[PDB]
Amino acid sequence: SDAKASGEFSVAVGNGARATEKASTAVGSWAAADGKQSTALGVGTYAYANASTALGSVAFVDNTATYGTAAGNRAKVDKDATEGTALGAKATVTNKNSVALGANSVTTRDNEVYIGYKTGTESDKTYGTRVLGGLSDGTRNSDAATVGQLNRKVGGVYDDVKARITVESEKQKKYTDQKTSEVNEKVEARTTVGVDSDGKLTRAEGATKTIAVNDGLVALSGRTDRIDYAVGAIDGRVTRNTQSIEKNSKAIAANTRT
Amino acid sequence: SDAKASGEFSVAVGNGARATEKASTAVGSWAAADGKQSTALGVGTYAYANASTALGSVAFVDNTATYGTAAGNRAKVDKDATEGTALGAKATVTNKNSVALGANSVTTRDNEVYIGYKTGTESDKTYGTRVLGGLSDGTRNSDAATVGQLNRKVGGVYDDVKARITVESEKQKKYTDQKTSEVNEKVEARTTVGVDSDGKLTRAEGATKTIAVNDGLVALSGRTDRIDYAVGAIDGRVTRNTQSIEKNSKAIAANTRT
Amino acid sequence: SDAKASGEFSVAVGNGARATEKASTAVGSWAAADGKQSTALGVGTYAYANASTALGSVAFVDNTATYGTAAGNRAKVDKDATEGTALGAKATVTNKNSVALGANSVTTRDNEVYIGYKTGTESDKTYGTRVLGGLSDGTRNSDAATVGQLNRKVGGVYDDVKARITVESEKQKKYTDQKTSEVNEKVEARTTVGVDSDGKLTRAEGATKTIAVNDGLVALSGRTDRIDYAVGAIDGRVTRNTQSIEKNSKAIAANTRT
Ligand SMILES: [Cl-]
Numbered sequence: 170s171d172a173k174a175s176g177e178f179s180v181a182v183g184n185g186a187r188a189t190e191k192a193s194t195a196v197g198s199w200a201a202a203d204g205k206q207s208t209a210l211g212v213g214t215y216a217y218a219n220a221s222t223a224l225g226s227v228a229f230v231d232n233t234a235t236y237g238t239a240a241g242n243r244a245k246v247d248k249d250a251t252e253g254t255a256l257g258a259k260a261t262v263t264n265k266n267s268v269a270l271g272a273n274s275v276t277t278r279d280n281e282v283y284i285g286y287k288t289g290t291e292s293d294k295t296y297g298t299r300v301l302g303g304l305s306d307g308t309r310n311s312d313a314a315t316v317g318q319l320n321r322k323v324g325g326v327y328d329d330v331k332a333r334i335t336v337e338s339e340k341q342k343k344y345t346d347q348k349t350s351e352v353n354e355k356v357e358a359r360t361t362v363g364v365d366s367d368g369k370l371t372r373a374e375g376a377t378k379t380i381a382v383n384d385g386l387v388a389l390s391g392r393t394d395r396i397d398y399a400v401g402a403i404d405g406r407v408t409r410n411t412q413s414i415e416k417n418s419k420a421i422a423a424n425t426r427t
Numbered sequence: 428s429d430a431k432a433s434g435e436f437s438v439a440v441g442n443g444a445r446a447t448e449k450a451s452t453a454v455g456s457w458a459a460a461d462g463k464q465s466t467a468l469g470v471g472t473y474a475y476a477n478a479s480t481a482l483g484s485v486a487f488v489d490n491t492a493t494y495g496t497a498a499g500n501r502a503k504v505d506k507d508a509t510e511g512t513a514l515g516a517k518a519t520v521t522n523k524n525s526v527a528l529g530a531n532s533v534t535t536r537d538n539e540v541y542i543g544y545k546t547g548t549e550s551d552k553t554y555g556t557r558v559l560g561g562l563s564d565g566t567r568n569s570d571a572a573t574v575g576q577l578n579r580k581v582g583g584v585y586d587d588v589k590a591r592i593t594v595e596s597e598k599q600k601k602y603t604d605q606k607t608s609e610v611n612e613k614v615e616a617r618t619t620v621g622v623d624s625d626g627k628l629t630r631a632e633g634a635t636k637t638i639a640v641n642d643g644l645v646a647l648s649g650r651t652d653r654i655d656y657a658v659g660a661i662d663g664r665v666t667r668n669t670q671s672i673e674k675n676s677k678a679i680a681a682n683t684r685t
Numbered sequence: 686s687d688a689k690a691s692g693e694f695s696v697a698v699g700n701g702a703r704a705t706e707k708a709s710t711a712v713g714s715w716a717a718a719d720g721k722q723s724t725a726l727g728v729g730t731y732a733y734a735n736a737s738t739a740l741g742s743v744a745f746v747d748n749t750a751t752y753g754t755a756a757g758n759r760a761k762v763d764k765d766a767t768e769g770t771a772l773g774a775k776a777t778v779t780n781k782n783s784v785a786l787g788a789n790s791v792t793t794r795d796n797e798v799y800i801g802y803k804t805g806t807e808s809d810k811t812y813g814t815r816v817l818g819g820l821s822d823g824t825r826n827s828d829a830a831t832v833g834q835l836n837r838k839v840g841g842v843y844d845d846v847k848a849r850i851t852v853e854s855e856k857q858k859k860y861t862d863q864k865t866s867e868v869n870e871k872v873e874a875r876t877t878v879g880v881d882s883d884g885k886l887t888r889a890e891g892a893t894k895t896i897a898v899n900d901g902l903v904a905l906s907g908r909t910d911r912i913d914y915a916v917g918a919i920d921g922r923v924t925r926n927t928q929s930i931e932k933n934s935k936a937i938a939a940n941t942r943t
């Protein structure tokens with residue numbers, strides 16, 4: 170039917186191609202550039218929105234998707250996805266200001282770059298994921314962190330925590346030793362007595378022989394037992410002496426004359 | 428005025444289009460491909476640098492930006508941005524070997540991929556950011572780390588640290604018990620005495636009754652008090668007996684005759 | 686020789702250009718679009734595979750690389766790299782369903798986006814890396830984590846671990862104090878005696894003066910020494926008294942008459 174270049178500055182090349190708005194360019198049979206400053210390249214390629222660019226056969230930018238850019242066979246920026254950018258065959262942008270990066274890629278949120286993709290004939294999953302490589306370590310808060318950075322950051326903190334736990338355990342050992350020692354000092358100061366050359370108990374301070382207070386008590390109690398017996402035995406003797414003395418006095422008096 | 432294809436192998440299509448260097452291609456009214464192996468597609472699209480490619484109306488590659496690639500309406504690779512790549516409408520590359528990815532995107536450093544973007548009519552911020560989705564977990568040090576990886580790596584270390592702190596606290600409990608027990612063993616060994624059937628103090632080892640050394644001392648001191656009194660009382664009696672005996676002897680002698 | 690548009694819906698523009706399959710479009714001298722729905726733009730640009738798109742002079746998609754998309758001077762999707770996407774001058778995709786993003790970029794794995802690149806005249810390294818900026822914090826497990834997130838996540842756990850170590854050290858202090866105190870209570874209960882107004886030993890409970898059991902034992906042993914001497918001395922006296930009494934009795938009897 171065409172080619173028909175009806176817009177100002179417009180160019181249309183190929184059978185059926187049409188460029189119908191100002192500054193539109195359509196190149197490829199049946200391509201259509203129906204937006205202002207729109208560009209369509211390839212067969213059946215449609216750049217319908219203002220400022221849209223569709224590159225590759227059957228690439229598509231919806232007429233509502235102002236500033237949409239689609240590159241690759243069947244790459245698409247869909248309804249309401251203003252400023253969408255689809256990069257790769259069969260990539261699809263369905264969100265504003267987002268990027269579907271890679272063949273078969275999709276978008277899921279606005280203001281997003283998405284590198285996951287519609288899986289084909291072999292996955293139970295709806296979307297597959299892509300590994301992202303070739304990164305320098307991020308420096309800014311909004312830079313991507315690498316696996317290397319993650320490991321080093323986590324490893325460093327892990328070693329620092331190991332180290333702190335060590336210091337604290339040593340502190341607790343030292344503490345218990347000093348606190349336990351305090352009580353041991355008291356025990357030692359109060360529970361021993363020195364023993365003399367002749368067995369006399371003395372202050373433990375700088376003494377040759379040393380014994381425990383309980384042993385000293387047992388031994389001293391034994392001495393007391395002996396003394397206790399003797400005192401009772403002597404008492405009996407003294408009583409009998411007294412009685413005999415008074416009996417002698419009486420007899421002396423009787424001799425004298427009573 | 429044109430179209431003018433003056434370079435070797437050059438092609439120019441559209442009113443005013445020009446392709447002026449070897450292997451240049453300009454397609455679109457007023458497009459210009461002025462670099463060697465340069466390609467311009469769309470109205471007013473300029474590929475000025477050697478090996479530059481500008482795709483979409485008003486896309487632009489500065490003549491100094493050798494190897495610059497710009498795709499999307501108004502996408503631009505600017506002065507000195509050699510090997511720049513602008514992907515999306517109004518994307519701008521101002522750094523060497525960098526990529527402005529997405530509509531409105533910019534670059535800030537050389538050797539950078541940048542997915543942040545010039546914000547429009549509604550932000551006090553100069554640049555907005557984009558969330559990046561669809562990643563497989565990175566495996567290499569220069570791979571991107573995912574949120575999933577970050578959480579699992581940090582969570583695992585966190586649990587490991589919990590576990591270590593537990594082991595160490597239990598070690599400190601066990602330690603204090605054993606150290607505190609040592610002193611308790613000493614206290615117990617030195618501060619008790621066994622008590623006999625008849626009250627005799629003995630070694631605490633395997634004794635029926637047991638008392639504390641201080642109680643034993645108090646009780647033994649009381650016995651000593653009693654003995655102390657008795658010894659003094661007996662002494663007085665013995666003194667008086669002696670005096671009476673000597674008096675009797677004198678009287679006996681007087682009876683005898685002195 | 687050409688231009689030759691021999692495919693259905695095909696368009697070829699430029700000397701030697703050829704579009705030889707259904708829905709193929711070749712624009713640029715010596716360009717070739719030899720795939721179904723293939724599109725080649727620029728001088729010597731080859732879109733050989735079905736559904737391939739090659740944009741920029743010398744851009745190339747291998748005939749086996751179905752759905753390959755290459756944008757930029759010399760950008761290439763190579764043998765067997767089906768669904769490859771090369772974005773930037775001299776970018777090369779050698780893996781299925783992968784993206785070489787940026788000038789000089791490469792791919793290393795299938796299902797990968799790669800932003801590292803072949804270094805040129807000044808590196809001993811084969812591949813350079815690119816910093817990735819402009820990210821919003823990831824929310825999903827497959828979102829990219831930012832440096833900001835990594836730091837905050839790691840910092841928060843680090844503070845939490847600090848805090849836990851503090852609590853546990855305080856627990857160990859409190860524990861040792863209470864356990865050490867228990868033994869101190871026992872020591873104090875068993876190792877002191879009260880001293881009376883008149884020196885009498887009593888239970889330490891609510892006493893004016895207090896002394897240690899070992900000191901009390903030493904002092905009590907000294908009293909016992911004194912008593913021990915006295916008992917022996919008194920015994921000698923009592924023996925002598927007895928002997929004198931019996932001698933007096935004998936003399937009294939002799940006086941009486943024996
Ligand atoms: Cl005694």
Ligand SMILES: [Cl-]
Pocket residue numbers: 406407410411664665668669922923926927
């Ligand atoms: Cl006597």
Ligand SMILES: [Cl-]
Pocket residue numbers: 413414417418671672675676929930933934
């Ligand atoms: Cl007498």
Ligand SMILES: [Cl-]
Pocket residue numbers: 420421424425678679682683936937940941
């Ligand atoms: Cl007489």
